[PDB]
Amino acid sequence: VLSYYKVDAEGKVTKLRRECSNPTCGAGVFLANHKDRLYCGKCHSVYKVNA
Amino acid sequence: ALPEKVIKAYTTVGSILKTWTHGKLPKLFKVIPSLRNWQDVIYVTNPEEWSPHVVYEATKLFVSNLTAKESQKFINLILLERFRDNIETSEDHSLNYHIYRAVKKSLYKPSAFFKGFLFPLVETGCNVREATIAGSVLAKVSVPALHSSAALSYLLRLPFSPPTTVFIKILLDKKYALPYQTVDDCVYYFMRFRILDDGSNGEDATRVLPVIWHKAFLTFAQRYKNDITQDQRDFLLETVRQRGHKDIGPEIRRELLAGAS
Amino acid sequence: AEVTIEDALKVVLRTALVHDGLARGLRESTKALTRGEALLVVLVSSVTEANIIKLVEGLANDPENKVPLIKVADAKQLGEWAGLGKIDREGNARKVVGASVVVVKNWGAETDELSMIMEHFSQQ
Protein backbone atom coordinates (compact mmCIF):
# COMPACT_ATOMS: atom_id res chain seq x y z
CA VAL A 1 0.00 0.00 0.00
CA LEU A 2 2.31 2.73 -1.32
CA SER A 3 1.94 5.84 -3.43
CA TYR A 4 5.27 7.33 -2.22
CA TYR A 5 7.24 7.02 -5.49
CA LYS A 6 7.02 10.66 -6.55
CA VAL A 7 10.52 10.45 -7.99
CA ASP A 8 12.91 12.84 -9.70
CA ALA A 9 12.47 13.17 -13.48
CA GLU A 10 14.67 11.68 -16.24
CA GLY A 11 14.91 9.14 -14.73
CA LYS A 12 16.88 7.84 -11.78
CA VAL A 13 15.61 7.08 -8.28
CA THR A 14 16.95 9.72 -5.88
CA LYS A 15 14.60 9.98 -2.93
CA LEU A 16 13.42 12.76 -0.61
CA ARG A 17 13.21 11.53 3.05
CA ARG A 18 16.63 10.09 2.30
CA GLU A 19 17.70 6.44 2.05
CA CYS A 20 20.03 4.26 4.15
CA SER A 21 23.69 3.37 3.65
CA ASN A 22 24.65 -0.24 4.33
CA PRO A 23 26.39 -3.05 2.38
CA THR A 24 24.48 -5.68 4.36
CA CYS A 25 21.71 -5.38 1.76
CA GLY A 26 20.28 -3.12 -0.98
CA ALA A 27 19.35 -0.14 1.27
CA GLY A 28 17.49 1.62 -1.59
CA VAL A 29 14.20 2.50 0.20
CA PHE A 30 13.31 5.68 2.19
CA LEU A 31 13.87 6.68 5.80
CA ALA A 32 10.64 8.61 6.43
CA ASN A 33 8.12 9.71 9.08
CA HIS A 34 9.45 9.64 12.66
CA LYS A 35 8.10 11.20 15.89
CA ASP A 36 10.22 11.35 19.11
CA ARG A 37 11.45 7.81 18.32
CA LEU A 38 13.18 6.64 15.14
CA TYR A 39 13.37 3.30 13.42
CA CYS A 40 15.80 2.99 10.50
CA GLY A 41 14.76 -0.15 8.61
CA LYS A 42 17.10 -3.02 7.76
CA CYS A 43 20.24 -3.61 9.82
CA HIS A 44 22.71 -1.06 8.46
CA SER A 45 24.18 1.29 11.06
CA VAL A 46 21.58 1.98 13.75
CA TYR A 47 21.05 5.75 13.69
CA LYS A 48 19.85 7.05 17.07
CA VAL A 49 19.14 10.58 15.82
CA ASN A 50 16.29 12.92 16.77
CA ALA A 51 13.04 12.92 14.73
CA ALA B 1 38.40 -19.92 3.22
CA LEU B 2 38.93 -22.04 6.34
CA PRO B 3 39.79 -19.59 9.14
CA GLU B 4 37.78 -18.60 12.22
CA LYS B 5 37.84 -16.39 15.31
CA VAL B 6 39.31 -16.49 18.81
CA ILE B 7 36.23 -16.54 21.09
CA LYS B 8 34.74 -19.05 22.35
CA ALA B 9 32.17 -16.68 23.80
CA TYR B 10 29.20 -18.90 22.89
CA THR B 11 29.82 -21.08 25.94
CA THR B 12 28.86 -18.13 28.15
CA VAL B 13 25.96 -17.29 25.82
CA GLY B 14 24.94 -20.94 25.43
CA SER B 15 24.90 -21.38 29.19
CA ILE B 16 22.35 -18.55 29.28
CA LEU B 17 20.40 -20.14 26.39
CA LYS B 18 19.64 -23.20 28.55
CA THR B 19 17.63 -20.97 30.94
CA TRP B 20 15.89 -18.83 28.32
CA THR B 21 12.25 -18.04 29.01
CA HIS B 22 10.62 -16.34 26.00
CA GLY B 23 10.97 -13.53 23.49
CA LYS B 24 13.89 -13.04 21.10
CA LEU B 25 17.07 -15.10 21.39
CA PRO B 26 19.92 -12.63 22.10
CA LYS B 27 21.87 -10.43 19.68
CA LEU B 28 25.02 -12.55 19.98
CA PHE B 29 22.91 -15.55 18.97
CA LYS B 30 21.42 -13.56 16.07
CA VAL B 31 24.82 -13.44 14.31
CA ILE B 32 25.51 -17.20 14.00
CA PRO B 33 23.86 -18.18 10.65
CA SER B 34 25.42 -15.22 8.79
CA LEU B 35 28.85 -16.90 8.89
CA ARG B 36 29.94 -19.53 6.41
CA ASN B 37 31.21 -21.39 9.49
CA TRP B 38 27.86 -21.31 11.35
CA GLN B 39 27.99 -25.12 11.70
CA ASP B 40 30.86 -25.17 14.20
CA VAL B 41 29.61 -21.99 15.93
CA ILE B 42 26.19 -23.45 16.74
CA TYR B 43 27.76 -26.67 18.07
CA VAL B 44 29.42 -24.63 20.83
CA THR B 45 26.02 -23.55 22.19
CA ASN B 46 25.07 -27.23 22.95
CA PRO B 47 22.08 -27.56 20.60
CA GLU B 48 20.98 -30.94 21.95
CA GLU B 49 20.06 -29.44 25.36
CA TRP B 50 17.68 -26.64 24.37
CA SER B 51 14.19 -25.62 25.47
CA PRO B 52 11.48 -25.54 22.76
CA HIS B 53 11.31 -21.73 22.75
CA VAL B 54 15.01 -21.69 21.81
CA VAL B 55 14.06 -24.34 19.22
CA TYR B 56 11.39 -22.00 17.82
CA GLU B 57 13.32 -18.72 17.66
CA ALA B 58 16.44 -20.64 16.61
CA THR B 59 14.79 -22.72 13.85
CA LYS B 60 12.94 -19.59 12.69
CA LEU B 61 16.32 -17.86 12.46
CA PHE B 62 18.20 -20.72 10.78
CA VAL B 63 15.66 -21.81 8.17
CA SER B 64 14.63 -18.33 7.03
CA ASN B 65 18.22 -17.07 6.55
CA LEU B 66 20.44 -19.96 5.38
CA THR B 67 20.44 -21.08 1.77
CA ALA B 68 18.63 -24.26 0.76
CA LYS B 69 21.94 -26.10 0.53
CA GLU B 70 22.86 -24.76 3.98
CA SER B 71 19.39 -25.37 5.43
CA GLN B 72 19.72 -28.86 3.94
CA LYS B 73 22.76 -29.40 6.16
CA PHE B 74 21.02 -27.75 9.12
CA ILE B 75 17.92 -29.95 8.95
CA ASN B 76 19.96 -33.01 7.93
CA LEU B 77 22.44 -32.71 10.80
CA ILE B 78 20.27 -31.32 13.60
CA LEU B 79 16.49 -31.15 13.11
CA LEU B 80 16.26 -34.72 11.81
CA GLU B 81 18.24 -35.97 14.80
CA ARG B 82 16.29 -33.70 17.14
CA PHE B 83 13.06 -35.01 15.59
CA ARG B 84 13.96 -38.69 16.02
CA ASP B 85 15.32 -37.99 19.51
CA ASN B 86 12.06 -36.23 20.41
CA ILE B 87 10.22 -39.34 19.24
CA GLU B 88 12.52 -41.87 20.91
CA THR B 89 13.30 -40.19 24.25
CA SER B 90 9.71 -39.18 24.98
CA GLU B 91 7.92 -42.00 26.78
CA ASP B 92 4.62 -41.32 25.01
CA HIS B 93 6.67 -41.36 21.76
CA SER B 94 4.53 -38.51 20.45
CA LEU B 95 5.08 -34.93 19.41
CA ASN B 96 5.04 -32.08 21.92
CA TYR B 97 2.88 -29.07 21.05
CA HIS B 98 5.89 -26.79 21.49
CA ILE B 99 7.48 -29.18 19.02
CA TYR B 100 4.26 -28.51 17.11
CA ARG B 101 5.51 -25.22 15.65
CA ALA B 102 8.76 -23.89 14.13
CA VAL B 103 8.92 -27.15 12.13
CA LYS B 104 6.03 -26.36 9.81
CA LYS B 105 6.82 -22.76 10.23
CA SER B 106 9.93 -23.90 8.34
CA LEU B 107 7.98 -25.81 5.68
CA TYR B 108 6.69 -22.80 3.67
CA LYS B 109 9.74 -23.16 1.42
CA PRO B 110 9.56 -26.96 0.93
CA SER B 111 12.78 -27.29 -1.11
CA ALA B 112 15.23 -27.17 1.80
CA PHE B 113 12.66 -29.08 3.86
CA PHE B 114 12.61 -31.96 1.38
CA LYS B 115 16.37 -31.91 0.83
CA GLY B 116 16.93 -31.80 4.59
CA PHE B 117 14.13 -33.75 6.26
CA LEU B 118 11.83 -35.81 4.04
CA PHE B 119 14.13 -37.47 1.50
CA PRO B 120 16.54 -38.97 4.11
CA LEU B 121 13.58 -39.86 6.34
CA VAL B 122 11.43 -41.91 3.98
CA GLU B 123 14.53 -43.64 2.60
CA THR B 124 16.01 -44.43 6.05
CA GLY B 125 14.13 -45.48 9.17
CA CYS B 126 10.59 -44.45 8.31
CA ASN B 127 7.76 -46.03 10.31
CA VAL B 128 4.07 -45.67 11.12
CA ARG B 129 4.55 -43.03 13.83
CA GLU B 130 6.68 -40.81 11.58
CA ALA B 131 4.05 -41.35 8.88
CA THR B 132 1.31 -40.33 11.30
CA ILE B 133 3.09 -37.25 12.65
CA ALA B 134 4.92 -36.40 9.42
CA GLY B 135 1.80 -37.48 7.53
CA SER B 136 -0.01 -34.83 9.53
CA VAL B 137 2.90 -32.51 8.68
CA LEU B 138 2.67 -32.78 4.89
CA ALA B 139 -1.02 -31.89 4.45
CA LYS B 140 -1.30 -28.72 6.54
CA VAL B 141 1.22 -26.41 4.81
CA SER B 142 1.62 -24.91 1.32
CA VAL B 143 3.24 -26.97 -1.44
CA PRO B 144 3.47 -26.29 -5.20
CA ALA B 145 3.04 -28.83 -7.97
CA LEU B 146 6.69 -29.62 -8.73
CA HIS B 147 7.64 -30.62 -5.18
CA SER B 148 4.44 -32.63 -4.72
CA SER B 149 4.84 -34.49 -8.01
CA ALA B 150 8.60 -34.94 -7.64
CA ALA B 151 8.46 -36.08 -4.01
CA LEU B 152 5.41 -38.17 -4.91
CA SER B 153 7.34 -39.93 -7.69
CA TYR B 154 10.20 -40.40 -5.22
CA LEU B 155 7.66 -42.16 -3.02
CA LEU B 156 6.57 -44.25 -6.02
CA ARG B 157 10.17 -45.37 -6.66
CA LEU B 158 10.17 -47.17 -3.24
CA PRO B 159 9.11 -50.72 -2.28
CA PHE B 160 5.82 -51.31 -0.50
CA SER B 161 5.27 -50.11 3.05
CA PRO B 162 2.10 -48.72 4.70
CA PRO B 163 4.09 -45.73 6.14
CA THR B 164 5.05 -44.75 2.59
CA THR B 165 1.43 -45.40 1.59
CA VAL B 166 0.33 -42.79 4.15
CA PHE B 167 2.47 -40.09 2.47
CA ILE B 168 1.21 -41.25 -0.94
CA LYS B 169 -2.36 -40.85 0.36
CA ILE B 170 -1.59 -37.36 1.74
CA LEU B 171 -0.16 -36.27 -1.61
CA LEU B 172 -3.22 -37.76 -3.32
CA ASP B 173 -5.43 -35.69 -0.99
CA LYS B 174 -4.34 -32.46 -2.70
CA LYS B 175 -6.20 -33.40 -5.94
CA TYR B 176 -3.92 -31.57 -8.37
CA ALA B 177 -4.28 -32.08 -12.12
CA LEU B 178 -0.94 -33.86 -12.38
CA PRO B 179 1.41 -33.90 -15.37
CA TYR B 180 1.00 -37.10 -17.32
CA GLN B 181 4.39 -38.60 -16.39
CA THR B 182 3.44 -38.41 -12.70
CA VAL B 183 0.10 -40.00 -13.61
CA ASP B 184 1.94 -42.78 -15.44
CA ASP B 185 4.19 -43.21 -12.41
CA CYS B 186 1.05 -43.68 -10.30
CA VAL B 187 -0.47 -46.20 -12.72
CA TYR B 188 2.81 -48.08 -13.16
CA TYR B 189 3.14 -48.08 -9.38
CA PHE B 190 -0.31 -49.49 -8.64
CA MET B 191 -0.30 -52.02 -11.49
CA ARG B 192 2.49 -54.19 -10.08
CA PHE B 193 0.60 -55.13 -6.90
CA ARG B 194 -1.71 -57.57 -8.66
CA ILE B 195 -0.66 -61.19 -9.03
CA LEU B 196 0.98 -61.63 -12.43
CA ASP B 197 1.84 -64.88 -14.20
CA ASP B 198 5.33 -65.60 -15.55
CA GLY B 199 7.39 -65.28 -12.37
CA SER B 200 7.22 -63.06 -9.29
CA ASN B 201 6.50 -59.32 -9.02
CA GLY B 202 8.45 -59.96 -6.74
CA GLU B 203 7.23 -60.57 -3.22
CA ASP B 204 5.36 -57.29 -2.57
CA ALA B 205 2.34 -58.29 -4.70
CA THR B 206 1.83 -61.64 -2.95
CA ARG B 207 1.83 -60.26 0.61
CA VAL B 208 -1.32 -59.03 2.33
CA LEU B 209 -2.12 -55.39 1.62
CA PRO B 210 -3.51 -53.15 4.39
CA VAL B 211 -6.43 -50.74 4.29
CA ILE B 212 -4.14 -47.76 3.55
CA TRP B 213 -3.44 -49.06 0.04
CA HIS B 214 -7.17 -49.25 -0.65
CA LYS B 215 -7.61 -45.75 0.78
CA ALA B 216 -4.83 -44.14 -1.27
CA PHE B 217 -5.68 -46.09 -4.42
CA LEU B 218 -9.32 -45.30 -3.63
CA THR B 219 -8.43 -41.59 -3.60
CA PHE B 220 -6.60 -41.95 -6.93
CA ALA B 221 -9.69 -43.73 -8.27
CA GLN B 222 -11.88 -40.87 -7.03
CA ARG B 223 -10.03 -37.82 -8.31
CA TYR B 224 -8.05 -39.33 -11.19
CA LYS B 225 -10.77 -41.28 -13.01
CA ASN B 226 -11.08 -38.63 -15.74
CA ASP B 227 -7.37 -38.04 -16.47
CA ILE B 228 -6.06 -41.58 -17.16
CA THR B 229 -6.22 -43.51 -20.41
CA GLN B 230 -8.54 -46.46 -21.03
CA ASP B 231 -5.76 -49.07 -20.99
CA GLN B 232 -4.70 -47.75 -17.59
CA ARG B 233 -8.32 -48.07 -16.45
CA ASP B 234 -8.48 -51.67 -17.67
CA PHE B 235 -5.14 -52.53 -16.05
CA LEU B 236 -6.12 -50.99 -12.71
CA LEU B 237 -9.47 -52.81 -12.87
CA GLU B 238 -7.41 -55.94 -13.51
CA THR B 239 -5.53 -55.07 -10.31
CA VAL B 240 -8.85 -54.54 -8.44
CA ARG B 241 -10.36 -57.86 -9.55
CA GLN B 242 -7.37 -59.74 -8.10
CA ARG B 243 -6.38 -57.69 -5.04
CA GLY B 244 -9.50 -55.73 -4.08
CA HIS B 245 -10.73 -55.01 -0.58
CA LYS B 246 -13.91 -56.56 0.83
CA ASP B 247 -15.46 -53.10 1.29
CA ILE B 248 -13.23 -50.62 -0.54
CA GLY B 249 -12.49 -52.80 -3.60
CA PRO B 250 -15.92 -52.74 -5.33
CA GLU B 251 -16.08 -49.01 -4.64
CA ILE B 252 -12.73 -48.59 -6.43
CA ARG B 253 -14.19 -50.69 -9.26
CA ARG B 254 -17.30 -48.49 -9.35
CA GLU B 255 -15.25 -45.28 -9.43
CA LEU B 256 -13.03 -46.67 -12.19
CA LEU B 257 -16.15 -47.55 -14.18
CA ALA B 258 -17.41 -44.04 -13.42
CA GLY B 259 -14.44 -42.46 -15.19
CA ALA B 260 -14.25 -41.27 -18.78
CA SER B 261 -11.75 -40.05 -21.41
CA ALA C 1 1.32 -15.54 -34.46
CA GLU C 2 1.95 -18.61 -36.67
CA VAL C 3 5.54 -17.35 -37.22
CA THR C 4 8.65 -17.73 -35.03
CA ILE C 5 8.31 -14.40 -33.14
CA GLU C 6 6.53 -13.16 -29.92
CA ASP C 7 6.83 -16.56 -28.21
CA ALA C 8 10.11 -16.00 -26.32
CA LEU C 9 8.51 -14.29 -23.29
CA LYS C 10 5.95 -17.14 -23.27
CA VAL C 11 8.76 -19.66 -22.62
CA VAL C 12 11.45 -17.49 -20.95
CA LEU C 13 8.87 -17.02 -18.19
CA ARG C 14 9.10 -20.81 -17.76
CA THR C 15 12.91 -21.14 -17.95
CA ALA C 16 13.35 -18.01 -15.77
CA LEU C 17 10.64 -19.16 -13.35
CA VAL C 18 13.08 -21.99 -12.50
CA HIS C 19 15.40 -19.61 -10.63
CA ASP C 20 12.57 -17.73 -8.82
CA GLY C 21 13.83 -14.21 -9.60
CA LEU C 22 10.42 -12.70 -10.36
CA ALA C 23 10.43 -9.34 -8.52
CA ARG C 24 6.76 -8.49 -9.02
CA GLY C 25 5.18 -5.54 -7.25
CA LEU C 26 5.03 -1.80 -6.61
CA ARG C 27 7.84 -1.34 -4.10
CA GLU C 28 9.57 -4.66 -4.53
CA SER C 29 10.24 -4.95 -8.24
CA THR C 30 13.07 -2.54 -7.33
CA LYS C 31 14.76 -5.51 -5.57
CA ALA C 32 15.81 -6.85 -8.96
CA LEU C 33 15.80 -3.25 -10.25
CA THR C 34 18.53 -2.05 -7.83
CA ARG C 35 20.94 -3.72 -10.31
CA GLY C 36 20.92 -4.24 -14.04
CA GLU C 37 21.50 -8.00 -13.91
CA ALA C 38 17.90 -8.37 -15.05
CA LEU C 39 17.76 -8.54 -18.86
CA LEU C 40 14.26 -8.71 -20.38
CA VAL C 41 11.96 -6.82 -18.03
CA VAL C 42 8.44 -6.45 -19.38
CA LEU C 43 6.27 -3.55 -18.18
CA VAL C 44 2.79 -2.03 -18.35
CA SER C 45 1.76 1.54 -17.66
CA SER C 46 -2.02 1.79 -17.64
CA VAL C 47 -4.20 1.35 -14.59
CA THR C 48 -4.02 4.20 -12.00
CA GLU C 49 -1.71 6.51 -9.95
CA ALA C 50 0.95 7.41 -12.59
CA ASN C 51 3.85 6.37 -10.35
CA ILE C 52 5.41 3.10 -11.54
CA ILE C 53 5.09 4.44 -15.08
CA LYS C 54 7.57 7.14 -14.02
CA LEU C 55 9.64 4.48 -12.27
CA VAL C 56 9.84 2.24 -15.35
CA GLU C 57 10.78 5.24 -17.53
CA GLY C 58 13.81 5.82 -15.26
CA LEU C 59 14.88 2.29 -14.31
CA ALA C 60 14.55 1.15 -17.94
CA ASN C 61 16.03 4.32 -19.48
CA ASP C 62 18.80 5.42 -17.09
CA PRO C 63 21.93 6.85 -18.82
CA GLU C 64 23.97 3.72 -17.91
CA ASN C 65 23.52 0.11 -19.13
CA LYS C 66 20.25 -1.92 -19.04
CA VAL C 67 18.26 0.04 -21.60
CA PRO C 68 15.54 -2.13 -23.20
CA LEU C 69 12.03 -1.04 -24.11
CA ILE C 70 9.33 -3.74 -24.25
CA LYS C 71 6.27 -1.55 -23.29
CA VAL C 72 3.58 -4.22 -24.01
CA ALA C 73 0.37 -3.36 -22.14
CA ASP C 74 -2.59 -5.30 -20.70
CA ALA C 75 -1.07 -7.02 -17.64
CA LYS C 76 -4.20 -9.10 -16.96
CA GLN C 77 -3.25 -11.28 -19.94
CA LEU C 78 0.39 -11.16 -18.82
CA GLY C 79 -0.63 -13.86 -16.35
CA GLU C 80 -1.47 -15.93 -19.45
CA TRP C 81 2.00 -15.11 -20.74
CA ALA C 82 3.26 -16.06 -17.26
CA GLY C 83 3.34 -19.58 -15.78
CA LEU C 84 0.26 -19.72 -13.53
CA GLY C 85 -1.02 -22.75 -15.46
CA LYS C 86 -0.01 -26.37 -14.95
CA ILE C 87 -2.10 -26.93 -18.05
CA ASP C 88 -1.66 -30.55 -19.37
CA ARG C 89 -3.97 -29.07 -21.82
CA GLU C 90 -7.25 -30.88 -20.97
CA GLY C 91 -6.23 -31.46 -17.35
CA ASN C 92 -5.76 -28.00 -15.81
CA ALA C 93 -8.83 -27.32 -13.51
CA ARG C 94 -6.49 -25.01 -11.62
CA LYS C 95 -5.76 -21.49 -10.38
CA VAL C 96 -6.61 -19.47 -13.52
CA VAL C 97 -6.28 -16.12 -11.65
CA GLY C 98 -3.64 -13.56 -12.46
CA ALA C 99 0.18 -13.61 -12.60
CA SER C 100 1.04 -9.99 -13.71
CA VAL C 101 4.16 -7.89 -14.66
CA VAL C 102 7.51 -9.59 -14.06
CA VAL C 103 11.12 -8.48 -13.65
CA VAL C 104 13.21 -11.20 -15.31
CA LYS C 105 16.51 -12.05 -13.69
CA ASN C 106 18.32 -15.30 -14.50
CA TRP C 107 17.07 -16.04 -18.05
CA GLY C 108 17.42 -19.87 -18.13
CA ALA C 109 16.91 -19.98 -21.92
CA GLU C 110 19.81 -19.57 -24.30
CA THR C 111 19.74 -17.56 -27.58
CA ASP C 112 17.08 -19.63 -29.37
CA GLU C 113 13.83 -17.73 -28.71
CA LEU C 114 15.32 -14.62 -27.03
CA SER C 115 17.30 -13.20 -29.98
CA MET C 116 14.10 -13.13 -32.04
CA ILE C 117 12.30 -10.20 -30.40
CA MET C 118 15.13 -8.75 -28.29
CA GLU C 119 18.09 -8.80 -30.67
CA HIS C 120 16.44 -9.10 -34.11
CA PHE C 121 13.61 -6.69 -33.23
CA SER C 122 14.49 -4.30 -30.38
CA GLN C 123 18.25 -3.61 -30.38
CA GLN C 124 20.34 -2.65 -33.44
Side-chain angles (χ1 to χ4, degrees), chain A, chain B residues 1 3 9 14 23 26 33 47 52 58 68 102 110 112 116 120 125 131 134-135 139 144-145 150-151 159 162-163 177 179 199 202 205 210 216 221 244 249-250 258-260, chain C residues 1 4 6-85 91 93 96-124:
Chain A
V1 186
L2 288 177
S3 180
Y4 288 171
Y5 282 148
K6 183 194 295 187
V7 79
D8 299 330
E10 200 266 328
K12 68 171 98 184
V13 182
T14 56
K15 297 180 293 296
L16 299 172
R17 298 290 191 171
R18 72 206 190 281
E19 65 185 355
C20 179
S21 76
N22 205 6
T24 63
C25 284
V29 198
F30 301 96
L31 293 176
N33 198 359
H34 288 156
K35 181 66 171 62
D36 287 329
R37 192 194 288 108
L38 270 66
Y39 204 79
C40 291
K42 219 267 144 249
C43 296
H44 348 291
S45 332
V46 180
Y47 281 160
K48 290 183 282 306
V49 197
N50 58 359
Chain C
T4 60
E6 91 159 352
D7 296 329
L9 191 141
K10 187 175 289 184
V11 187
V12 177
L13 290 178
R14 180 177 280 277
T15 61
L17 194 145
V18 176
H19 299 283
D20 287 329
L22 308 179
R24 296 179 281 175
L26 196 145
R27 173 179 175 269
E28 296 170 336
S29 296
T30 62
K31 309 287 180 282
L33 297 171
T34 41
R35 63 179 66 76
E37 289 184 353
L39 58 89
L40 197 148
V41 177
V42 81
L43 66 103
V44 306
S45 68
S46 67
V47 173
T48 304
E49 287 171 35
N51 293 318
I52 58 97
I53 308 166
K54 191 175 187 184
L55 299 172
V56 166
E57 287 183 358
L59 287 166
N61 293 319
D62 52 352
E64 290 293 323
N65 204 0
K66 183 58 180 298
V67 281
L69 194 64
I70 189 162
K71 290 290 295 183
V72 184
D74 194 77
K76 286 180 294 289
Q77 196 182 3
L78 204 143
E80 185 182 350
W81 287 292
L84 60 92
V96 193
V97 299
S100 170
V101 183
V102 296
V103 173
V104 175
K105 291 204 296 192
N106 204 350
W107 60 99
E110 191 150 28
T111 70
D112 48 356
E113 293 94 10
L114 289 84
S115 295
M116 196 66 64
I117 60 169
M118 195 69 194
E119 177 64 31
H120 180 75
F121 185 72
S122 73
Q123 186 66 256
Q124 292 83 17

